[PDB]
């Protein structure tokens, strides 16, 4: 009945219509906004939080139906900073006690890669850079699954992994003419912003593909590097499950070790343990021990002069 609630529910419905979501999504998201509004802390929240809340309710709905809407997309539409969105999203998930499924990688691959403008020639997209949409999506998905199996996805932003995988899929589909094109040049012609971590994901994915190539006798003999491995990506993905298992020691049946990159960073110091002390909080406190924390009359005068 509240004027700010009616305005909020109208904004929830308008966001769903702008996002072209299925008809069932609007009702679920409206229900979450109504539920949110039953808490006094949400009812008395700033109009800016009530604007972000519109987005949180629509994002939660999309996540539960594996609709690949990112927090970045919502922040753009709501003119909200991500940390502003993070505090409202984390609060409302705790407050409504909600189970929020993860971003669906397979669905994000389809939506994000379809935005890559490489399926028709143009002044900025030459003929040799044009690729089949289905061939591109299928190979990118296989490379995203590989990155996921070889611990490159866990704890990282999923989008830069898809950017690196889409680029590698595109290069591997015509290696002779596309190996000269860098990740930055590729995102520029496809008209997609380059996420900064995508270059790191690329290098990690190329390192994984190189370890795999060592498991095929006819590829091991070619002494491949991060450039020459690209034309064999098709061959490597054809036997990805098998090659991953063979290339890495760590894995159950129910020198290379399959581990997350943050475990192989190899710093010269790992968790400098706090020193074991069992000192009782009942020990005597001397006057000299305390007096060192007090200013002298001269120190007081010198501070007062400086203020």
């Amino acid at each position: 009945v509240s004027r700010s609630q009616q305005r909020g529910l109208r904004r929830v419905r308008d966001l769903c219509r702008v996002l072209q979501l299925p008809p069932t999504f609007e009702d679920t998201a409206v229900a979450y906004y109504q539920q949110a509004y039953r808490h006094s802390g949400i009812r008395a929240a700033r109009l800016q939080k009530k604007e972000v809340l519109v987005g949180c309710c629509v994002l939660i709905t999309c996540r539960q139906h594996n609709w690949p809407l990112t927090m970045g997309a919502i922040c753009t539409l709501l003119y909200a900073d991500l940390d502003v969105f993070s505090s409202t999203y984390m609060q409302i998930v705790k407050l409504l006690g909600l189970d929020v499924p993860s971003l669906c990688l397979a669905e994000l691959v389809k939506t994000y890669c379809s935005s890559f403008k490489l399926f028709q020639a143009s002044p900025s997209v030459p003929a040799k850079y044009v690729e089949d949409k289905e061939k591109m999506l299928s190979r990118t998905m296989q490379l995203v699954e590989l990155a996921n199996e070889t611990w490159l996805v866990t704890g990282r932003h999923p989008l830069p992994v898809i950017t690196a995988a889409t680029f590698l899929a595109w290069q591997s589909l015509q290696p002779a003419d596309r190996l000269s094109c860098s990740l930055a040049r590729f995102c520029k012609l496809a008209n997609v912003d380059l996420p900064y971590p995508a270059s790191s994901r690329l290098q990690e994915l190329l390192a994984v593909l190189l370890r795999m190539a060592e498991q095929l006798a006819w590829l091991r003999v070619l002494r491949l590097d991060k450039r020459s491995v690209v034309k064999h990506i098709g061959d490597l993905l054809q036997h990805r499950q098998s090659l991953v298992r063979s290339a890495f020691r760590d894995g159950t049946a129910e020198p290379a070790l399959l581990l997350p990159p943050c475990m192989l960073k190899s710093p010269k110091r790992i968790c400098p343990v706090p020193p074991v002390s069992t000192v009782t909080g009942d020990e005597n406190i001397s006057d000299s021990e305390i007096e060192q924390y007090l200013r002298t009359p001269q120190e007081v005068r010198d501070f007062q002069r400086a203020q």
Binding site: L19, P195, D302
Partner: protein, 97 residues
């Protein structure tokens, strides 16, 4: 527009790295002031209160012995002397670098 836009934090606010002698000067401030970070942030014209507090908390970790020594080694607090010495240290060392 897009529904797959990359999600990154934007409220990041940049601080310059501490010069080896700009650090020497930071430890001079713990000797003159103590641990009042706002007052030390006034002794540094291009360093905010937070910048002093984060520097203190970094030095606290990596070089604990230096934080403890600068506090135990009490020194007369001369605002003017610090200002002139800091302006010269940030100039001379930048020149020699």
């Amino acid at each position: 527009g897009s529904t797959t836009t990359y999600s990154s934090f934007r409220k990041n606010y940049y601080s310059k790295p501490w010069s080896n002698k700009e650090t020497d000067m930071f430890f001079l401030a713990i000797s003159m002031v103590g641990t009042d970070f706002s007052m030390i942030g006034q002794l540094f014209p291009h360093r905010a209160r937070i910048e002093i507090k984060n520097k203190f908390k970094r030095e606290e970790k990596t070089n604990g012995w230096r934080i403890d020594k600068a506090f135990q080694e009490k020194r007369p607090f001369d605002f003017d002397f610090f200002a002139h010495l800091l302006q010269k240290v940030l100039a001379e060392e930048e020149k020699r670098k």
